[PDB]
A = this chain, B = another copy of it.
Amino acid sequence: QYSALRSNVSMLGKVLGETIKDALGEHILERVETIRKLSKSSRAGNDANRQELLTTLQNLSNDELLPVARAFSQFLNLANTAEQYHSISPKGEAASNPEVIARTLRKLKNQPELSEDTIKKAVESLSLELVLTAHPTEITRRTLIHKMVEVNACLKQLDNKDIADYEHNQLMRRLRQLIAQSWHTDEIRKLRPSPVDEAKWGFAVVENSLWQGVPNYLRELNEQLEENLGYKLPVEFVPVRFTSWMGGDRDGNPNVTADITRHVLLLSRWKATDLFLKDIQVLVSELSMVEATPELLALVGEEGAAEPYRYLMKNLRSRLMATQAWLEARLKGEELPKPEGLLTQNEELWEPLYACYQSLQACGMGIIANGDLLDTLRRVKCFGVPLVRIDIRQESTRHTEALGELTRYLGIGDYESWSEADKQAFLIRELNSKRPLLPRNWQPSAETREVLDTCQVIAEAPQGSIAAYVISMAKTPSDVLAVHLLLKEAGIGFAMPVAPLFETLDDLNNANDVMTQLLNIDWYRGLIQGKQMVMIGYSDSAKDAGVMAASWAQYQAQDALIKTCEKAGIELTLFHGRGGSIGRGGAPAHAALLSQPPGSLKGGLRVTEQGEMIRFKYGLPEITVSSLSLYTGAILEANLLPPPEPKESWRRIMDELSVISCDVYRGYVRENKDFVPYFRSATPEQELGKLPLGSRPAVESLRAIPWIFAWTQNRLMLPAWLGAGTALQKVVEDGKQSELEAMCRDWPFFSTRLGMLEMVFAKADLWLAEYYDQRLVDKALWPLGKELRNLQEEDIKVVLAIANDSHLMADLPWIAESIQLRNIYTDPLNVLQAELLHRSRQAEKEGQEPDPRVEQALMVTIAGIAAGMRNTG
């Protein structure tokens, strides 16, 4: 029963509607109401109201565009907040209810042939690391996280039956205030955000939600272990860590220079000082205890021995205040010797804090220890000094060029011409060399200098600020050895985890070969210290060969690497990229984590949280708890109860599925002559590049994000389904339909794969897709349009047939329902966006000036549409 949800959306829409009424017009509200009516009509076949819609939109003046677009965008905004409130609300989906953890724990516990020590060890070895990434379509100048927390609080309070009418009146008064705020507090970036801006949004997510969320997650998790298993993890064990790529990822982004990284690195520390100060203030005042242990008194001895815990907190406050002061100078561009007690490592924070905990426990003040201090202890290890460690990522190709240029300058030869055996020879030689290689005062090209400067920032930064060096486009063993050489030349004192990123079908296919050669080099083996971390690029390989082939390729590569590393005694860590079924969030993700080759999470969960899903996965502290709890259950279950190995005939169905699907996908994307011209007309791809959407500067050249995003705006969702159904119907046509059904029933990998198409098919919309062709595509490309649309119609059948259902994502009614709601609310943004694109595109055709009203309205729909559709890849 989704009645409460329906009530809330209606309510919020009434207050929003009121606000627009007050604000500036009843005219705009009529505009809005006419467009929905007319669009609903047109869809239901009325071809008279289709004309009326077309003339209605063409008659909108440029001064109506933005308000209309914002209007539609606001209603969608209210729907998602109603939707998200419902999810954590105990009388609704209840996402954050601690049973999520307990259900997993009970299942494990009463499973024969599962020793209790086996379960304990899996618990003690848990590890999660969530890597935040930028939001591709964040359209405003300042983060709205905190406002959202407030709107949700107001809804929580109104949920209480028995609320005295005066309280209700008060609550509604603030609610009205808050909605008016957003209608009138309009901010629209005029210029492309910068890596620092994006890095800043990530700090907003940390302070408005992760800061409270992680410790609550850790408290609940701990209560559940004791209740169900009979023990609590030790205080020193904090299995969660947050990392960011913001200001760390330079892959394809000129604007993320070594200077910016240096800066962002600095800012994080400034912000950790900001948040750590608030924690310590509280502690300085609340720890008025005077009873301490011999050991703790020793640690202060006299002076502050009459207010011991307060002493240690007072010291740290100063030490934090000192380093704060230092970093604001550095941020300003002022160089000045660093203070006596500058903070650089988490141990410097941990140490004293842990001292208090111990004496408080020892001395009978357990409940005080396990309160605010415990929360601070865990934030120390979860976020610490750097607040959020960053990851650096550059293409392999750029490292080759840096090293080629170097070698020709030195007269040694030209590294980018040598065979791969030669490069390894050269790299192992130099890696063992005690004489330097990088010329004292050199004059390389801009590019090369950037490569060199960035390793200098890495080297310069305090150990533990940078999590890893990711090599996008890794193809050979020399690609990994290359960055180790550069880091050595940059003077690095510690071992920095380097990770190849295989993100193509063939790279995926060669991945296990690439790593066994690497593991065979004794020098390499001893440098990683029994730990490797690979990165699987599902999203980019999917752009390469289609999702089915991509998926199967990934399945196979992880299975081979798990095995190879096991032989070799290396603790493998699979690093997951963006989207896919692992980035679905919620139940589907739990399913997806469990549907990976056995071994797969033995070395932890490390994932790239997609930018556009942060609100939906970590948007509020309770959603954070849900998300971390969901994942934690998946780790323990996947490690204690792995999926079965596929039957050999299944493997053969996958090979063939994979071939047919890749074959059909490339047929259109690469081989077909009309595609590109089609693609640039039917989707807003070109304009996604021009507008100020991401920090990167304004089919093989494109990147996954822009590929996926452009097709989602169009509503066809092309990238996430294309050859899958076609190959599946063909296998059905050989009478192997019952094997397909067994695979689905018995092989997690396969149901999960099939699951994922349904959701995509659930959000896709062929009426809208066709609407864009009619408004934006030239008549000669219409045939391709219908062709691709009919391909999809036929693919839902086969999938529905294999799944033995008639509705579409029938095992997930809440998600199905939530998709249904957003789909109606997103509807008119798509209807309006087609008019914008047409207005915008004819101005340029008529060699005219980019009207700011038309572009800003366009930017609103793009962000609206992206918000309603969430994950589509």
Q: Which A residues are within 8 Å of any B CB, using their own CB?
A: 19, 22-24, 90-91, 94, 96-98, 142, 160-164, 166-167, 169, 173, 176-177, 180-181, 184-187, 219, 223, 285-286, 288-289, 364-368, 371-372
Contacts and interface: CB of A to CB of B under 8 A. Distances in A.
Contacts of A96: 166
A161 B162 CA distance: 8
Given A19-B367, A161-B161, A161-B162, 15 more contacts: A22-B364, A22-B366, A22-B367, A23-B364, A90-B163, A90-B164, A90-B166, A90-B167, A94-B164, A142-B285, A160-B162, A180-B368, A181-B286, A181-B368, A184-B368
A364 B164 contact: no
A159 to B, nearest CB: 9
A177 B289 contact: no
A98 B166 contact: yes
A170 to B, nearest CB: 8
A157 to B, nearest CB: 9
Given A97-B166, A98-B166, A367 B288 contact: no
Given A160-B160, A166-B97, A177-B371, A288 B22 contact: no
Nearest to A370: B177
A84 B630 CA distance: 41
Contacts of A176: 367
Contacts of A22: 364, 366-367
A185 B289 contact: yes
B289 A364 contact: no
A288 B23 contact: no
A368 B371 CA distance: 38
B97 A186 contact: no
A365 to B, nearest CB: 6
A860 to B, nearest CB: 16
A364 B181 contact: no
A249 to B, nearest CB: 29
Contacts of A90: 163-164, 166-167
B367 A180 contact: yes
Nearest to A185: B288
A245 B579 CA distance: 65
Contacts of A169: 223
A184 B289 contact: yes
Contacts of A285: 142
17 contacts: A90-B167, A96-B166, A142-B285, A160-B160, A160-B162, A161-B162, A176-B367, A177-B367, A177-B368, A177-B371, A180-B367, A180-B371, A181-B286, A181-B368, A184-B289, A185-B286, A185-B288
A484 B715 CA distance: 83
Nearest to A289: B184
A19 B219 CA distance: 20
Given A184-B289, A288-B187, A91 B162 contact: yes
A223 B219 CA distance: 44
A23 B367 CA distance: 9
Nearest to A219: B173
Contact of A184 (B94, B166, B186, B365): B365
A173 B374 CA distance: 14
Contacts of A91: 162, 164
A837 to B, nearest CB: 27
A366 to B, nearest CB: 7
Contacts of A24: 364
A367 B185 CA distance: 12
A66 to B, nearest CB: 13
A843 to B, nearest CB: 25
Of A180, A285, A372, most B-chain CB atoms within 10 Å: A180
Contact of A164 (B97, B160, B180, B187): B97
A90 B223 CA distance: 34
Contacts of A286: 181, 185
Top 6 A-B pairs, shortest CB-CB distance: A90-B164, A180-B367, A177-B371, A160-B160, A185-B288, A98-B166
Nearest to A161: B162
A187 to B, nearest CB: 6
Contacts of A185: 286, 288-289
A834 to B, nearest CB: 29
A713 B23 CA distance: 62
A105 to B, nearest CB: 15
Contacts of A161: 161-162
A364 B286 CA distance: 47
A289 B162 CA distance: 38
A177 B180 CA distance: 38
Contacts of A163: 90
A321 to B, nearest CB: 15
Nearest to A216: B170
A230 to B, nearest CB: 18
A307 to B, nearest CB: 11
Of A160, A184, A285, A371, most B-chain CB atoms within 10 Å: A184
A98 to B, nearest CB: 5
Contacts of A368: 177, 180-181, 184
A74 to B, nearest CB: 15
A163 B97 CA distance: 12
A22 B360 CA distance: 13
A94 B164 CA distance: 10
Contacts of A366: 22
A364 B161 CA distance: 35
A163 B177 CA distance: 27
A71 to B, nearest CB: 16
A169 B164 CA distance: 25
A797 to B, nearest CB: 42
Nearest to A90: B164
Of A160, A187, A286, most B-chain CB atoms within 10 Å: A160
Given A90-B166, A91-B162, A162-B91, A186 B367 contact: no
Nearest to A366: B22
A97 B187 CA distance: 39
Of A19, A176, A285, A371, most B-chain CB atoms within 10 Å: A371
A312 to B, nearest CB: 16
Contacts of A162: 91, 160-161
Contacts of A19: 367
A849 to B, nearest CB: 21
Contacts of A365: 180, 184
Contacts of A177: 367-368, 371-372
A403 to B, nearest CB: 48
Contacts of A186: 288
Contacts of A181: 286, 368
A180 to B, nearest CB: 4
A186 B366 CA distance: 16
Contacts of A219: 173
A707 to B, nearest CB: 35
Nearest to A371: B177
A90 B169 CA distance: 13
Contacts of A160: 160, 162
A187 B288 CA distance: 8
A187 B97 CA distance: 39
Contacts of A289: 184-185
A364 B19 CA distance: 10
A537 to B, nearest CB: 39
A365 B288 CA distance: 48
A164 B99 CA distance: 12
A453 to B, nearest CB: 35
Contacts of A97: 164, 166
A742 to B, nearest CB: 40
Contacts of A288: 185-187
Contacts of A167: 90
A96 B165 CA distance: 12
Contacts of A223: 169
A185 B161 CA distance: 37
Contacts of A180: 365, 367-368, 371
A56 B96 CA distance: 52
A653 to B, nearest CB: 44
